[PDB]
Amino acid sequence: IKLMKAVILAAGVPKPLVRVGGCEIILRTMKLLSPHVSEFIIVASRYADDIDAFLKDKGFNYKIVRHDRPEKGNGYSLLVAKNHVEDRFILTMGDHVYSQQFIEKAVRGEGVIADREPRFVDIGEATKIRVEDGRVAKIGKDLREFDCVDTGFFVLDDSIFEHAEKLRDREEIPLSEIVKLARLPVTYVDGELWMDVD
Amino acid sequence: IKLMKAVILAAGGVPKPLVRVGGCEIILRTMKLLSPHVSEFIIVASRYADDIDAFLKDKGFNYKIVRHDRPEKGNGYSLLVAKNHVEDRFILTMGDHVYSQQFIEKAVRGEGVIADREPRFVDIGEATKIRVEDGRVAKIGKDLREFDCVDTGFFVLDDSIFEHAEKLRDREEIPLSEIVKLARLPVTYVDGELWMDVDTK
């Protein structure tokens, strides 16, 4: 799997700086992604200065991209990262914890990384996915019919911005809405250790 | 392993026991996993006692909130405050720690401090470490230079713990690790299972 940029959504103590097992959430993700990543694009808002200060002495090649609309959602944060990426790129959440085993499989994937065997997360509370012909048909926390769970990890193409731009003029831009509109391919990474902190 | 009471230390924005990890509050995950082994939960709380009580009311568990107004005294004081709510062998756990079912199943069958010789998730450098001598705690702390295992924050205690905890009552801060050391607690190994602490500093 060739080197690519990794976009970390850290906008809207900040959640990326919460320590899980003695290590900040964002630091765990960056350490695990670093052998596969040329540059980290960290999209942040109010805590951009706090994250930048934390990361300064860490030894990673990173850029903080700031916006002023945390209320516009994760889909808006992806649109703000458009000019900082080209071709295939990793997209992840700054509030999710992933194991090395999860990361090693996920970086080799395409589209949304989905879990058919969630071992840690509560299925009822999780963002669910209904798959049709290896692509996202339905996505949401309240799906009644579903086959897998959204892990908040993605391997995206520049073609994602074509779908995200269609929602550019809306009040809230949910990332799940872009995923559905793009009919994103699904890659299964089953039963590996991953969890969200909220 | 016979039914016993479980003491959850939840004293000293959003309180740590109410932080959601994988869509479930930390304290709720621990209680759900402990519930088949536990007769009553004794939750030691301070500032957020009302918030925890209100959260737990509709959950279906048999629990009692034990309050104190000294969170600055530490976890060692929180355990001393639980003395009159327990008799004989009881479980002691932290409200900021996440444990798996596999961890809990082995941990409830243990004695003294549950320690991990193979930590798979937690950062060893940041963890509370333990140096063991003849199956008992010889040294304990976050800055040990010589150690063989990591403190999981899970314990199976006897009423004899209060005899050691009482010795430190007129102290400014009562660290739980200091009581553990003074008691020369036996160690039970639960290796490489899923467990982690949630903190900020």
Swiss-Prot record, chain A:
Q: Which Cys-Cys disulfides exist here?
A: none
Q: How does the record describe its quaternary structure? A: Forms a mixture of monomers and dimers in solution, with prevalence of the monomeric form.
Can you tell me which family this protein belongs to?
Answer: In the N-terminal section; belongs to the MobA family. In the C-terminal section; belongs to the CDP-alcohol phosphatidyltransferase class-I family.
Q: Its function?
A: Involved in biosynthesis of di-myo-inositol phosphate (DIP), a widespread organic solute in microorganisms adapted to hot environments. Catalyzes the condensation of CTP and L-myo-inositol-1-phosphate into CDP-L-myo-inositol, as well as the biosynthesis of di-myo-inositol-1,3'-phosphate-1'-phosphate (DIPP) from CDP-L-myo-inositol and L-myo-inositol-1-phosphate. The cytidylyltransferase is absolutely specific for CTP and L-myo-inositol-1-P.
The shown range, given as first to last of full length, is: 70 to 274 of 490
Q: Name the chain's protein.
A: Bifunctional IPC transferase and DIPP synthase
Where it sits in the cell: the answer is: Membrane
Q: What residues bind Mg(2+), as annotated?
A: 104
